Nucleic acid binder design. Sequence first.
RNA 1: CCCGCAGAAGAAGCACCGGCUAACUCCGUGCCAGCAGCCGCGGUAAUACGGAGGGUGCAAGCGUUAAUCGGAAUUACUGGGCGUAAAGCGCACGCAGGCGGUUUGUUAAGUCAGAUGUGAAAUCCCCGGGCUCAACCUGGGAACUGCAUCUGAUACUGGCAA
RNA 2: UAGCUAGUAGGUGGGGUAACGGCUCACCUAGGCGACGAUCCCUAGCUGGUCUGAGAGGAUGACCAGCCACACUGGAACUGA
Lengths: 123, 157, 82, 80, 129, 205
Amino acid sequence: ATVNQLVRKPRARKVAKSNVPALEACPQKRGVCTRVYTTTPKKPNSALRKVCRVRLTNGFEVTSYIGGEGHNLQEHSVILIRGGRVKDLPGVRYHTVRGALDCSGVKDRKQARSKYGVKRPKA
Amino acid sequence: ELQEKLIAVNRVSKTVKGGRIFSFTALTVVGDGNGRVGFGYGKAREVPAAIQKAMEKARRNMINVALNNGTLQHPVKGVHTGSRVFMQPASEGTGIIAGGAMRAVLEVAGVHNVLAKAYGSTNPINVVRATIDGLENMNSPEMVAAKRGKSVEEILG
Amino acid sequence: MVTIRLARHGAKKRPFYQVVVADSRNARNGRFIERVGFFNPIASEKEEGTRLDLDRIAHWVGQGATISDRVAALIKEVNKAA
Amino acid sequence: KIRTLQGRVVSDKMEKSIVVAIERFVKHPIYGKFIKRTTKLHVHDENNECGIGDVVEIRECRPLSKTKSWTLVRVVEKAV
Amino acid sequence: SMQDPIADMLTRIRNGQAANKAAVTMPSSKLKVAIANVLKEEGFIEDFKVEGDTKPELELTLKYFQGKAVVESIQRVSRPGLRIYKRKDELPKVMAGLGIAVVSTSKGVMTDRAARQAGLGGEIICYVA
Amino acid sequence: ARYLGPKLKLSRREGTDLFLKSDVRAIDTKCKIEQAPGQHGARKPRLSDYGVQLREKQKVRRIYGVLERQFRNYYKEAARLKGNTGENLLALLEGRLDNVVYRMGFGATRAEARQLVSHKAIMVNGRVVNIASYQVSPNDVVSIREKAKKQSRVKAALELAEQREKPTWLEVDAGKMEGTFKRKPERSDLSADINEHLIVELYSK
RNA sequence: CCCGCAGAAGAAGCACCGGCUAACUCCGUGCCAGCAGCCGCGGUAAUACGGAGGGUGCAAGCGUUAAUCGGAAUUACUGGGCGUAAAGCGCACGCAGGCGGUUUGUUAAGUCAGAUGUGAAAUCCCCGGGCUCAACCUGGGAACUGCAUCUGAUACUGGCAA
RNA sequence: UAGCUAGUAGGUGGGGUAACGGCUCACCUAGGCGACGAUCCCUAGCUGGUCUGAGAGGAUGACCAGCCACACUGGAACUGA
Ligand SMILES: [Mg+2]
Ligand SMILES: [Mg+2]
Ligand SMILES: [Mg+2]
Ligand SMILES: [Mg+2]
Ligand SMILES: [Mg+2]
Ligand SMILES: [Mg+2]
Ligand SMILES: [Mg+2]
Ligand SMILES: [Mg+2]
Ligand SMILES: [Mg+2]
Ligand SMILES: [Mg+2]
Ligand SMILES: [Mg+2]
Ligand SMILES: [Mg+2]
Ligand SMILES: [Mg+2]
Ligand SMILES: [Mg+2]
Ligand SMILES: [Mg+2]
Ligand SMILES: [Mg+2]
Ligand SMILES: [Mg+2]
Ligand SMILES: [Mg+2]
Ligand SMILES: [Mg+2]
Ligand SMILES: [Mg+2]
Ligand SMILES: [Mg+2]
Ligand SMILES: [Mg+2]
Ligand SMILES: [Mg+2]
Ligand SMILES: [Mg+2]
Ligand SMILES: [Mg+2]
Ligand SMILES: [Mg+2]
Ligand SMILES: [Mg+2]
Ligand SMILES: [Mg+2]
Ligand SMILES: [Mg+2]
């Protein structure tokens, strides 16, 4: 492109689009569990993945994954929502922070406890 | 005495009536560590035989580069297919700064201090060719003085 | 009123006053017309405890600048040491 | 001895005033191509001696009107 | 149309070298004569001459060394669209000094080395290596 | 803030003697030096170039007892300084007070020298220095304090000191237990099986 | 800050180990539970799930998420393209704008050189100095690529004249 | 978002201010700005600087410092350098 053309119409960089719009540039957000259910993943994989719909403190209502084996969540349980998508589940772009707020930790977990809110075993 | 380094190993396949025939290709570079570098590329059904064919080919087809105390004479651009490489002389202590494909070639060549970067396609097979061509066209003050019909300092000083 | 005074910058428990000429209304560590030396209360006794460009100080004093008690003490002490 | 600008008169339809365009070369901040830029100034012209298209020499002065802050020092060339 | 005769000269040199021509000829000009003079003095060409009065033709006799062109790369820098001016301390050097940069200064056309040694800057006409 | 675990494990991982023991005994009579630690030590790793760079950096770090943050700051300072970056990095590493104490032989190992420094047993220009990373400068006098000079470990350590090769750039008077840091060591006087340029690459990857 | 007493005595965790990327086996599980940054795992010996042993990397921290730059030569001015991969208007004329053959003179606008003023202090950088070292504080300098004025140079671009 | 502007643009004279000035008046002239983006809308305190980057640049303006604006929202004057 000619320099003359550039001085007439300057280059205009694309604005990066975020992949986590509901967080509004916050690392976590609080929310209430509206419904807690299971869904099946994409064609290649096969499972019953645990998800929950959560209405955020900023009005946004979005679906979030519930990692780990076992959870005690029901309607009106307030949970902390963290960034991070789950690939084989379209529409779910958020994770639940295990061990934060009402959300409890994973039972008997020993390795990678800090990612699931499990206290250091007293042994 | 020459030092040889294997840059990349890749598995190719050919399809025939019965099915897929698997083979391997090997890209290697040999060097004298004092300004002479050659590259080789071999094919075989098994990896050790492919590497040995590549070594034998690499020993020939080798060229001389007029190094300057382990660094280049002047900045150089090289171009082959979509691989555009840029190299420049560097001060002592810098070491070898380059991508892997260029890193191996320069290390076996003996360039101790060089700043390099590859633009465009980083395909190792063509990056090596473009690096070799760039290093080959790089001339020295004595050769440029010989061409221009003058002395060294008459260009330097 | 133009005044000559110390702008303490230093660090915690280790002050390093900077003699500066400034309008008295501006904050202590703020706008200053001209710096005319430094003073370090803590001194290794081999360093320069106080440096003063007495000439510029005299220039501003003649122009009419007043002098803080501590800057007057510093000027008097350096002239006495000489 | 006196700071001064030189320009051409683009319009004189105002009473005792004229607008002069001062054009200069400036290296483009990024691309580099030297581009022409124009600055139009409302200038004070006693006697209305400046015709449109004339090339005039101007100097800065005190505010003379809401916009006028420059006075005509001399005409350089007129009625091209 | 024709709008950079110095570019035309450089391109004639480049294409004649590529085509292994012994000599090249082009419409002359004082600037072309000075650029040919600096090239000759720096030894990138054998010699040059001008023939005629009303439509002067300038002719450059090129030079080859090992079946190779002595001039490896000749490129215009300050093209008409974008003029490139440099100060005495900003004068570029080609191939870390192995090549030459042609500079037009207030004291005539000369190399970057000469301009630096004379403490002047100017318009970077072209690079030759 | 310091590595406290077993020491010969590191030497086994790096495949060479790191002088992590006093030396009185041949290391091969104390461990299987030529085999990597762990269940799968015997298998040999076809190690990538990044692996060899990491191994070189770890070797130097574990030789000098320096953790990653401090070593990174050392690299930044060496890069800032004029001259060969790797060479000034090695000079900075060899200028540590604990290393100087070990070279003058007051400690059988660098860890023992570090403990000596920490426990107010070393003086620099007649001043008590308790920081391991204190940079020693040319024409400095490092001395054992009188009160700590009667420790049996230092008199024991001087024998190992006289049994290892004597550095050129230090003048040690063992009788008075004092020494003079004549000059910064060059590259040539220290071991030549350290590939500092690998570290230079690793901190520019 | 220094001196004395006691006693190894009061003090090590976190992530990872299929490839990218340094570090591997056993047991449990059986496309379930589950993992995941991407590629991808899991349907009966799983180095990819969970536990153990071993190991690798950091360390009084370690990981996860969010945001910016980088890698991205992926807005390319330095530094990209347009026959078929996204990209030459259906074609022509033409105003504003961009560029312009060759010689002589003149101009000093652009350009170059020099000087002056100014570009606050702190921050970055260099040589040093003081807190036992460092962070930190601090002396002098460089820099602040700029802007304006004045005196010069006249090759190139521009103006004017032929 | 392609047109905007009647104290708007300029002038004479009077008034007002510490001061020049459509600052305000009375009258006269009918102009002024704009594709080198006026007007309109959205967004935002600016700078020395900070992060990043080989560099040019990209982002950013917390702490320190210089400047501006506001003091429940809207408006107004008084005292006073
Ligand atoms: Mg399938
Ligand atoms: Mg072949
Ligand atoms: Mg590509
Ligand atoms: Mg620490
Ligand atoms: Mg590995
Ligand atoms: Mg089973
Ligand atoms: Mg896992
Ligand atoms: Mg199994
Ligand atoms: Mg596992
Ligand atoms: Mg993230
Ligand atoms: Mg970019
Ligand atoms: Mg492209
Ligand atoms: Mg197409
Ligand atoms: Mg067509
Ligand atoms: Mg023109
Ligand atoms: Mg002409
Ligand atoms: Mg001028
Ligand atoms: Mg400053
Ligand atoms: Mg000190
Ligand atoms: Mg300082
Ligand atoms: Mg002319
Ligand atoms: Mg009036
Ligand atoms: Mg006004
Ligand atoms: Mg706001
Ligand atoms: Mg970059
Ligand atoms: Mg106010
Ligand atoms: Mg309030
Ligand atoms: Mg109010
Ligand atoms: Mg009053």
